[PDB]
Amino acid sequence: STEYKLVVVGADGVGKSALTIQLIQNHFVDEYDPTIEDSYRKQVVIDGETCLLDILDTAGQEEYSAMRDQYMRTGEGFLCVFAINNTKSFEDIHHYREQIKRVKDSEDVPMVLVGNKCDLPSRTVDTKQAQDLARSYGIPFIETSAKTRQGVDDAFYTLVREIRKHKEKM
């Protein structure tokens, strides 16, 4: 069992809690308290390795949080989530990413850019701008849907893969 500390970040309403609960409990939450921050520890198999994912589902954008401070410093991977029907959530990505890098004091922080809510027809963030942004960062870009579970596993498994590549480089 190999441990992996992940932190799910992104604007309110992007689907962080829904993505996290889809991964851990295999159910879509239509409503979930936007205010609650919580951690989850689940055993999973990724590329033959039995992993233990310790995920922090962040909340409370405007307020202080000691748990999020501890997870931002010690976290190995960060799932940077935006919603494809929300250009402001996409525009906040660089802010979360640069905040993460500064708290980590490193330009080598494993991250995956997630474009959640790909099941919706009303779309505002073109796959091109998000792909170009991920390419500029040198990070993978996965489109997901917590509602249909599309790409949910691929998003967190890819983050674990980025952490392995970083861990073997150092």
Binding site: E63, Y64, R68, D69, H95, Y96, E98, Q99, R102, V103
Partner: peptide, 11 residues
């Protein structure tokens, strides 16, 4: 007070 915001209060 590490930004940008991002999370408020990350110091």
């Amino acid at each position: 007070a590490i930004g940008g915001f991002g999370f408020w209060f990350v110091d």
